[PDB]
PDB file of N, CA and C in Angstrom:
ATOM      1  N   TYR A 482     -21.902 -55.306 -35.466  1.00 38.09           N
ATOM      2  CA  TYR A 482     -23.241 -55.585 -35.992  1.00 38.09           C
ATOM      3  C   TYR A 482     -23.036 -57.080 -36.653  1.00 38.09           C
ATOM      4  N   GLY A 483     -23.881 -57.974 -36.450  1.00 39.02           N
ATOM      5  CA  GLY A 483     -23.695 -59.213 -37.399  1.00 39.02           C
ATOM      6  C   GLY A 483     -24.435 -59.188 -38.298  1.00 39.02           C
ATOM      7  N   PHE A 484     -24.112 -59.267 -39.681  1.00 36.37           N
ATOM      8  CA  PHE A 484     -25.009 -59.304 -40.635  1.00 36.37           C
ATOM      9  C   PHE A 484     -24.696 -60.548 -41.510  1.00 36.37           C
ATOM     10  N   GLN A 485     -25.736 -61.854 -41.439  1.00 37.24           N
ATOM     11  CA  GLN A 485     -26.123 -62.639 -41.912  1.00 37.24           C
ATOM     12  C   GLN A 485     -27.256 -62.496 -43.018  1.00 37.24           C
ATOM     13  N   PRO A 486     -27.223 -62.953 -44.019  1.00 33.29           N
ATOM     14  CA  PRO A 486     -28.183 -62.968 -45.082  1.00 33.29           C
ATOM     15  C   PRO A 486     -29.565 -63.232 -44.532  1.00 33.29           C
ATOM     16  N   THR A 487     -29.353 -64.186 -43.562  1.00 30.54           N
ATOM     17  CA  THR A 487     -30.560 -64.597 -42.877  1.00 30.54           C
ATOM     18  C   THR A 487     -31.140 -63.481 -41.727  1.00 30.54           C
ATOM     19  N   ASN A 488     -30.788 -62.275 -41.649  1.00 26.92           N
ATOM     20  CA  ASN A 488     -30.862 -61.607 -40.804  1.00 26.92           C
ATOM     21  C   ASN A 488     -32.254 -60.870 -40.568  1.00 26.92           C
ATOM     22  N   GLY A 489     -33.093 -60.578 -41.402  1.00 27.40           N
ATOM     23  CA  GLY A 489     -34.560 -60.160 -40.730  1.00 27.40           C
ATOM     24  C   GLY A 489     -34.511 -58.759 -41.217  1.00 27.40           C
ATOM     25  N   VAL A 490     -35.854 -58.069 -41.047  1.00 24.44           N
ATOM     26  CA  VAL A 490     -35.584 -56.700 -41.520  1.00 24.44           C
ATOM     27  C   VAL A 490     -35.087 -55.838 -40.609  1.00 24.44           C
ATOM     28  N   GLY A 491     -35.434 -55.921 -39.322  1.00 25.77           N
ATOM     29  CA  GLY A 491     -34.639 -55.011 -38.463  1.00 25.77           C
ATOM     30  C   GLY A 491     -33.364 -55.040 -38.158  1.00 25.77           C
ATOM     31  N   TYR A 492     -33.230 -56.312 -38.189  1.00 23.75           N
ATOM     32  CA  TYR A 492     -31.643 -57.127 -38.051  1.00 23.75           C
ATOM     33  C   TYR A 492     -30.932 -56.738 -39.099  1.00 23.75           C
ATOM     34  N   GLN A 493     -31.312 -56.494 -40.624  1.00 23.33           N
ATOM     35  CA  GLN A 493     -30.784 -56.413 -41.569  1.00 23.33           C
ATOM     36  C   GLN A 493     -29.819 -54.979 -41.696  1.00 23.33           C
ATOM     37  N   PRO A 494     -28.876 -55.140 -42.633  1.00 25.80           N
ATOM     38  CA  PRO A 494     -28.067 -53.867 -42.359  1.00 25.80           C
ATOM     39  C   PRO A 494     -28.264 -52.911 -43.797  1.00 25.80           C
ATOM     40  N   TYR A 495     -28.438 -51.885 -43.369  1.00 30.37           N
ATOM     41  CA  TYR A 495     -28.896 -50.975 -44.455  1.00 30.37           C
ATOM     42  C   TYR A 495     -27.553 -49.632 -44.528  1.00 30.37           C
ATOM     43  N   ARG A 496     -27.534 -49.318 -45.711  1.00 28.39           N
ATOM     44  CA  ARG A 496     -26.707 -48.302 -46.112  1.00 28.39           C
ATOM     45  C   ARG A 496     -26.939 -47.176 -45.936  1.00 28.39           C
ATOM     46  N   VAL A 497     -26.302 -46.024 -45.404  1.00 29.38           N
ATOM     47  CA  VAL A 497     -26.665 -44.840 -45.280  1.00 29.38           C
ATOM     48  C   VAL A 497     -25.616 -43.805 -45.704  1.00 29.38           C
ATOM     49  N   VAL A 498     -26.240 -42.673 -45.903  1.00 28.48           N
ATOM     50  CA  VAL A 498     -25.793 -41.509 -46.457  1.00 28.48           C
ATOM     51  C   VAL A 498     -26.482 -40.339 -45.861  1.00 28.48           C
ATOM     52  N   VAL A 499     -25.824 -39.289 -45.312  1.00 34.32           N
ATOM     53  CA  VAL A 499     -26.185 -38.091 -44.679  1.00 34.32           C
ATOM     54  C   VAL A 499     -25.687 -37.318 -45.725  1.00 34.32           C
ATOM     55  N   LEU A 500     -26.594 -36.463 -46.533  1.00 37.86           N
ATOM     56  CA  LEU A 500     -26.203 -35.108 -47.234  1.00 37.86           C
ATOM     57  C   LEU A 500     -26.321 -34.042 -46.411  1.00 37.86           C
ATOM     58  N   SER A 501     -25.197 -33.978 -45.644  1.00 39.17           N
ATOM     59  CA  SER A 501     -25.496 -32.604 -44.980  1.00 39.17           C
ATOM     60  C   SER A 501     -25.131 -31.148 -45.772  1.00 39.17           C
ATOM     61  N   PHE A 502     -25.718 -30.327 -45.427  1.00 36.98           N
ATOM     62  CA  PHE A 502     -25.459 -29.238 -46.312  1.00 36.98           C
ATOM     63  C   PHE A 502     -25.161 -27.944 -45.835  1.00 36.98           C
ATOM     64  N   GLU A 503     -24.114 -27.173 -46.425  1.00 38.67           N
ATOM     65  CA  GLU A 503     -23.845 -25.930 -45.604  1.00 38.67           C
ATOM     66  C   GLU A 503     -24.775 -25.171 -45.855  1.00 38.67           C
ATOM     67  N   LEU A 504     -24.521 -23.753 -45.374  1.00 39.30           N
ATOM     68  CA  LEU A 504     -25.627 -22.682 -45.780  1.00 39.30           C
ATOM     69  C   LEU A 504     -25.034 -21.672 -46.588  1.00 39.30           C
ATOM     70  N   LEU A 505     -25.915 -20.735 -47.213  1.00 42.35           N
ATOM     71  CA  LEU A 505     -25.401 -19.433 -48.132  1.00 42.35           C
ATOM     72  C   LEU A 505     -25.306 -18.370 -46.955  1.00 42.35           C
ATOM     73  N   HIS A 506     -24.129 -18.888 -46.221  1.00 43.54           N
ATOM     74  CA  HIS A 506     -23.410 -17.691 -45.456  1.00 43.54           C
ATOM     75  C   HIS A 506     -22.237 -17.419 -46.189  1.00 43.54           C
ATOM     76  N   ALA A 507     -21.870 -18.127 -47.281  1.00 43.28           N
ATOM     77  CA  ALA A 507     -20.119 -18.162 -47.779  1.00 43.28           C
ATOM     78  C   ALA A 507     -20.402 -18.391 -49.317  1.00 43.28           C
ATOM     79  N   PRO A 508     -19.230 -18.269 -49.756  1.00 41.52           N
ATOM     80  CA  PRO A 508     -19.075 -18.963 -51.511  1.00 41.52           C
ATOM     81  C   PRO A 508     -19.787 -19.978 -51.807  1.00 41.52           C
ATOM     82  N   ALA A 509     -20.534 -19.884 -53.006  1.00 40.82           N
ATOM     83  CA  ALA A 509     -21.111 -21.160 -53.362  1.00 40.82           C
ATOM     84  C   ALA A 509     -20.410 -22.347 -54.364  1.00 40.82           C
ATOM     85  N   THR A 510     -20.088 -23.186 -53.648  1.00 41.76           N
ATOM     86  CA  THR A 510     -19.688 -24.568 -54.511  1.00 41.76           C
ATOM     87  C   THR A 510     -20.282 -25.640 -55.299  1.00 41.76           C
ATOM     88  N   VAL A 511     -21.399 -25.974 -55.095  1.00 43.74           N
ATOM     89  CA  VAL A 511     -22.267 -27.140 -55.850  1.00 43.74           C
ATOM     90  C   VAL A 511     -23.558 -26.378 -56.065  1.00 43.74           C
ATOM     91  N   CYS A 512     -24.058 -26.569 -57.216  1.00 44.47           N
ATOM     92  CA  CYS A 512     -25.339 -26.189 -57.702  1.00 44.47           C
ATOM     93  C   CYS A 512     -26.469 -27.212 -58.303  1.00 44.47           C
ATOM     94  N   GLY A 513     -27.359 -26.690 -58.226  1.00 42.76           N
ATOM     95  CA  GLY A 513     -28.340 -27.689 -58.788  1.00 42.76           C
ATOM     96  C   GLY A 513     -28.361 -26.979 -60.435  1.00 42.76           C
ATOM     97  N   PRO A 514     -28.976 -28.213 -61.196  1.00 42.34           N
ATOM     98  CA  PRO A 514     -28.651 -28.378 -62.536  1.00 42.34           C
ATOM     99  C   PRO A 514     -29.471 -26.951 -63.336  1.00 42.34           C
ATOM    100  N   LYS A 515     -30.022 -26.061 -62.692  1.00 42.80           N
ATOM    101  CA  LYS A 515     -30.608 -24.911 -63.581  1.00 42.80           C
ATOM    102  C   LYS A 515     -29.632 -24.440 -64.615  1.00 42.80           C
ATOM    103  N   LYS A 516     -30.632 -23.493 -65.573  1.00 42.71           N
ATOM    104  CA  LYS A 516     -29.799 -22.887 -66.623  1.00 42.71           C
ATOM    105  C   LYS A 516     -29.666 -21.333 -65.993  1.00 42.71           C
ATOM    106  N   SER A 517     -28.726 -20.564 -66.637  1.00 42.13           N
ATOM    107  CA  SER A 517     -28.338 -19.445 -66.183  1.00 42.13           C
ATOM    108  C   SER A 517     -28.555 -18.271 -67.314  1.00 42.13           C
ATOM    109  N   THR A 518     -28.724 -17.007 -66.789  1.00 37.69           N
ATOM    110  CA  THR A 518     -29.383 -16.088 -68.051  1.00 37.69           C
ATOM    111  C   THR A 518     -28.359 -14.841 -67.996  1.00 37.69           C
ATOM    112  N   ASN A 519     -28.887 -13.800 -68.904  1.00 38.30           N
ATOM    113  CA  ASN A 519     -28.068 -12.413 -68.719  1.00 38.30           C
ATOM    114  C   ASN A 519     -28.466 -11.795 -67.416  1.00 38.30           C
ATOM    115  N   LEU A 520     -27.375 -11.590 -67.158  1.00 37.08           N
ATOM    116  CA  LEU A 520     -27.349 -10.020 -65.796  1.00 37.08           C
ATOM    117  C   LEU A 520     -28.096  -9.126 -65.727  1.00 37.08           C
ATOM    118  N   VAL A 521     -29.135  -8.764 -66.820  1.00 36.85           N
ATOM    119  CA  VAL A 521     -29.695  -7.291 -67.242  1.00 36.85           C
ATOM    120  C   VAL A 521     -30.089  -6.725 -65.503  1.00 36.85           C
ATOM    121  N   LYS A 522     -29.585  -5.429 -65.712  1.00 35.90           N
ATOM    122  CA  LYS A 522     -29.742  -4.692 -64.552  1.00 35.90           C
ATOM    123  C   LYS A 522     -30.358  -3.329 -64.940  1.00 35.90           C
ATOM    124  N   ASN A 523     -31.095  -2.747 -63.995  1.00 34.97           N
ATOM    125  CA  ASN A 523     -32.093  -1.636 -63.854  1.00 34.97           C
ATOM    126  C   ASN A 523     -33.329  -2.057 -64.068  1.00 34.97           C
ATOM    127  N   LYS A 524     -33.632  -3.242 -64.521  1.00 32.86           N
ATOM    128  CA  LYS A 524     -35.095  -3.606 -64.759  1.00 32.86           C
ATOM    129  C   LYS A 524     -35.506  -4.126 -63.547  1.00 32.86           C
ATOM    130  N   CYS A 525     -36.810  -4.075 -63.201  1.00 35.97           N
ATOM    131  CA  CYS A 525     -37.294  -4.988 -62.318  1.00 35.97           C
ATOM    132  C   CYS A 525     -37.326  -6.293 -62.804  1.00 35.97           C
ATOM    133  N   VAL A 526     -36.799  -7.631 -61.921  1.00 32.15           N
ATOM    134  CA  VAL A 526     -36.701  -8.764 -62.347  1.00 32.15           C
ATOM    135  C   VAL A 526     -36.854  -9.664 -61.287  1.00 32.15           C
ATOM    136  N   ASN A 527     -37.337 -11.083 -61.621  1.00 33.89           N
ATOM    137  CA  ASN A 527     -37.038 -11.854 -60.557  1.00 33.89           C
ATOM    138  C   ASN A 527     -35.559 -12.433 -60.438  1.00 33.89           C
ATOM    139  N   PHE A 528     -35.074 -12.658 -59.548  1.00 34.09           N
ATOM    140  CA  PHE A 528     -33.435 -13.122 -59.567  1.00 34.09           C
ATOM    141  C   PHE A 528     -33.360 -14.258 -58.525  1.00 34.09           C
ATOM    142  N   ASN A 529     -32.591 -15.302 -59.409  1.00 35.31           N
ATOM    143  CA  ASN A 529     -31.983 -16.293 -58.285  1.00 35.31           C
ATOM    144  C   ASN A 529     -30.561 -16.206 -58.356  1.00 35.31           C
TER     145      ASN A 529
ATOM    146  N   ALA B  14       6.395 -15.796 -18.530  1.00 36.62           N
ATOM    147  CA  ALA B  14       6.023 -14.595 -18.361  1.00 36.62           C
ATOM    148  C   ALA B  14       4.658 -14.274 -18.823  1.00 36.62           C
ATOM    149  N   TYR B  15       3.996 -13.161 -18.822  1.00 33.81           N
ATOM    150  CA  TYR B  15       2.649 -12.719 -19.231  1.00 33.81           C
ATOM    151  C   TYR B  15       2.592 -11.761 -19.777  1.00 33.81           C
ATOM    152  N   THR B  16       1.753 -11.638 -21.013  1.00 31.12           N
ATOM    153  CA  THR B  16       1.515 -10.037 -21.750  1.00 31.12           C
ATOM    154  C   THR B  16      -0.079 -10.110 -21.954  1.00 31.12           C
ATOM    155  N   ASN B  17      -0.157  -9.121 -22.334  1.00 33.87           N
ATOM    156  CA  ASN B  17      -1.943  -8.679 -22.419  1.00 33.87           C
ATOM    157  C   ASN B  17      -2.301  -8.536 -23.679  1.00 33.87           C
ATOM    158  N   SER B  18      -3.528  -9.477 -24.051  1.00 34.66           N
ATOM    159  CA  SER B  18      -3.900  -9.494 -25.459  1.00 34.66           C
ATOM    160  C   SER B  18      -4.829  -8.033 -26.074  1.00 34.66           C
ATOM    161  N   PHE B  19      -4.924  -7.538 -25.078  1.00 35.77           N
ATOM    162  CA  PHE B  19      -5.335  -6.357 -25.284  1.00 35.77           C
ATOM    163  C   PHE B  19      -6.963  -6.753 -25.971  1.00 35.77           C
ATOM    164  N   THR B  20      -7.360  -6.515 -27.307  1.00 34.85           N
ATOM    165  CA  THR B  20      -8.235  -6.434 -28.138  1.00 34.85           C
ATOM    166  C   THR B  20      -8.179  -7.941 -29.015  1.00 34.85           C
ATOM    167  N   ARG B  21      -7.035  -8.816 -29.338  1.00 32.36           N
ATOM    168  CA  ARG B  21      -7.203  -9.443 -30.483  1.00 32.36           C
ATOM    169  C   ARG B  21      -7.593 -10.835 -30.367  1.00 32.36           C
ATOM    170  N   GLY B  22      -7.698 -11.430 -31.610  1.00 31.78           N
ATOM    171  CA  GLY B  22      -8.457 -12.878 -31.215  1.00 31.78           C
ATOM    172  C   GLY B  22      -9.908 -12.918 -31.915  1.00 31.78           C
ATOM    173  N   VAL B  23     -10.402 -11.513 -32.416  1.00 32.58           N
ATOM    174  CA  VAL B  23     -11.859 -11.811 -33.142  1.00 32.58           C
ATOM    175  C   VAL B  23     -11.576 -11.929 -34.540  1.00 32.58           C
ATOM    176  N   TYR B  24     -12.549 -12.442 -35.157  1.00 34.40           N
ATOM    177  CA  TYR B  24     -12.378 -12.705 -36.570  1.00 34.40           C
ATOM    178  C   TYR B  24     -14.007 -12.572 -36.897  1.00 34.40           C
ATOM    179  N   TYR B  25     -13.862 -12.943 -38.432  1.00 33.91           N
ATOM    180  CA  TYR B  25     -15.274 -12.822 -39.097  1.00 33.91           C
ATOM    181  C   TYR B  25     -16.089 -13.743 -38.701  1.00 33.91           C
ATOM    182  N   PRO B  26     -17.016 -13.717 -38.285  1.00 34.59           N
ATOM    183  CA  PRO B  26     -18.122 -14.739 -37.765  1.00 34.59           C
ATOM    184  C   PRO B  26     -18.582 -15.892 -38.975  1.00 34.59           C
ATOM    185  N   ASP B  27     -18.881 -14.982 -39.986  1.00 38.19           N
ATOM    186  CA  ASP B  27     -19.455 -15.670 -41.358  1.00 38.19           C
ATOM    187  C   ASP B  27     -18.921 -14.957 -42.381  1.00 38.19           C
ATOM    188  N   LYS B  28     -18.992 -15.920 -43.543  1.00 37.27           N
ATOM    189  CA  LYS B  28     -18.596 -15.155 -44.833  1.00 37.27           C
ATOM    190  C   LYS B  28     -19.487 -14.183 -45.497  1.00 37.27           C
ATOM    191  N   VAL B  29     -20.510 -13.661 -44.659  1.00 35.91           N
ATOM    192  CA  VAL B  29     -21.479 -12.603 -45.100  1.00 35.91           C
ATOM    193  C   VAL B  29     -20.649 -11.107 -45.065  1.00 35.91           C
ATOM    194  N   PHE B  30     -21.040 -10.234 -46.087  1.00 35.90           N
ATOM    195  CA  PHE B  30     -20.635  -8.771 -46.067  1.00 35.90           C
ATOM    196  C   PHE B  30     -22.021  -7.607 -45.248  1.00 35.90           C
ATOM    197  N   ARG B  31     -21.523  -7.050 -44.521  1.00 35.30           N
ATOM    198  CA  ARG B  31     -22.455  -5.947 -43.702  1.00 35.30           C
ATOM    199  C   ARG B  31     -21.780  -4.779 -43.729  1.00 35.30           C
ATOM    200  N   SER B  32     -22.700  -3.539 -43.546  1.00 33.49           N
ATOM    201  CA  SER B  32     -21.491  -2.308 -43.338  1.00 33.49           C
ATOM    202  C   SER B  32     -22.593  -1.540 -42.569  1.00 33.49           C
ATOM    203  N   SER B  33     -21.670  -0.563 -41.680  1.00 31.65           N
ATOM    204  CA  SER B  33     -22.212   0.387 -41.036  1.00 31.65           C
ATOM    205  C   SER B  33     -23.274  -0.387 -40.123  1.00 31.65           C
ATOM    206  N   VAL B  34     -23.170  -1.107 -39.325  1.00 30.36           N
ATOM    207  CA  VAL B  34     -24.141  -2.228 -38.626  1.00 30.36           C
ATOM    208  C   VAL B  34     -23.348  -2.778 -37.461  1.00 30.36           C
ATOM    209  N   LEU B  35     -23.887  -2.490 -36.206  1.00 29.34           N
ATOM    210  CA  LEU B  35     -23.871  -3.289 -34.982  1.00 29.34           C
ATOM    211  C   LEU B  35     -23.926  -4.515 -34.736  1.00 29.34           C
ATOM    212  N   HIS B  36     -24.133  -5.600 -35.685  1.00 29.84           N
ATOM    213  CA  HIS B  36     -24.461  -7.014 -35.593  1.00 29.84           C
ATOM    214  C   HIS B  36     -23.701  -7.243 -34.389  1.00 29.84           C
ATOM    215  N   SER B  37     -24.473  -8.544 -33.526  1.00 31.44           N
ATOM    216  CA  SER B  37     -23.729  -8.895 -32.453  1.00 31.44           C
ATOM    217  C   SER B  37     -23.755 -10.647 -32.353  1.00 31.44           C
ATOM    218  N   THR B  38     -22.859 -11.394 -31.792  1.00 31.46           N
ATOM    219  CA  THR B  38     -23.077 -12.806 -31.977  1.00 31.46           C
ATOM    220  C   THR B  38     -22.419 -13.476 -30.714  1.00 31.46           C
ATOM    221  N   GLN B  39     -22.547 -15.002 -30.654  1.00 33.17           N
ATOM    222  CA  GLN B  39     -22.069 -15.525 -29.502  1.00 33.17           C
ATOM    223  C   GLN B  39     -21.227 -16.742 -30.202  1.00 33.17           C
ATOM    224  N   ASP B  40     -20.012 -16.699 -29.903  1.00 33.47           N
ATOM    225  CA  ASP B  40     -19.152 -17.942 -30.462  1.00 33.47           C
ATOM    226  C   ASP B  40     -17.668 -17.831 -29.647  1.00 33.47           C
ATOM    227  N   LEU B  41     -16.683 -19.003 -30.082  1.00 31.88           N
ATOM    228  CA  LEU B  41     -15.541 -19.095 -29.139  1.00 31.88           C
ATOM    229  C   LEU B  41     -14.693 -17.932 -29.563  1.00 31.88           C
ATOM    230  N   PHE B  42     -14.502 -17.236 -28.465  1.00 30.65           N
ATOM    231  CA  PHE B  42     -13.504 -16.010 -28.922  1.00 30.65           C
ATOM    232  C   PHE B  42     -12.748 -15.693 -27.576  1.00 30.65           C
ATOM    233  N   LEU B  43     -11.653 -15.295 -27.999  1.00 30.26           N
ATOM    234  CA  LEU B  43     -10.500 -14.824 -26.670  1.00 30.26           C
ATOM    235  C   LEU B  43     -10.990 -13.665 -26.157  1.00 30.26           C
ATOM    236  N   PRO B  44     -10.962 -13.841 -24.741  1.00 29.67           N
ATOM    237  CA  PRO B  44     -11.594 -12.632 -24.116  1.00 29.67           C
ATOM    238  C   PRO B  44     -10.910 -11.108 -24.369  1.00 29.67           C
ATOM    239  N   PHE B  45     -11.315 -10.114 -23.978  1.00 29.66           N
ATOM    240  CA  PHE B  45     -10.542  -8.919 -24.068  1.00 29.66           C
ATOM    241  C   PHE B  45      -9.954  -8.729 -22.604  1.00 29.66           C
ATOM    242  N   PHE B  46      -8.578  -8.174 -23.006  1.00 27.72           N
ATOM    243  CA  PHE B  46      -7.587  -7.782 -22.118  1.00 27.72           C
ATOM    244  C   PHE B  46      -7.445  -9.324 -21.222  1.00 27.72           C
ATOM    245  N   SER B  47      -7.160 -10.245 -21.985  1.00 29.85           N
ATOM    246  CA  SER B  47      -6.960 -11.700 -21.492  1.00 29.85           C
ATOM    247  C   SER B  47      -5.310 -11.485 -21.190  1.00 29.85           C
ATOM    248  N   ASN B  48      -4.942 -12.175 -20.228  1.00 33.65           N
ATOM    249  CA  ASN B  48      -3.568 -12.665 -19.957  1.00 33.65           C
ATOM    250  C   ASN B  48      -2.986 -13.758 -20.830  1.00 33.65           C
ATOM    251  N   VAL B  49      -2.387 -13.415 -21.589  1.00 32.66           N
ATOM    252  CA  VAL B  49      -1.772 -14.519 -22.528  1.00 32.66           C
ATOM    253  C   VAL B  49      -0.136 -14.679 -22.116  1.00 32.66           C
TER     254      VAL B  49
END
């Protein structure tokens, strides 16, 4: 691709990142910033 | 020469646990009784 600063909208260069994500079929590696809590069992609870 | 694979070349399709279940899938696997 030729990219001069003169290029034009369609013509201009664009940087791209594809964040491909694997799925939760396997061990978890990278996580969202959430807090973590106690493991409390035997109680009915919402769980993540 | 040749030898027969019998059963081998099957692997866990995914990192998930399952028990007492007949689960079935399609993937790249060595065929049974294949001549190796």
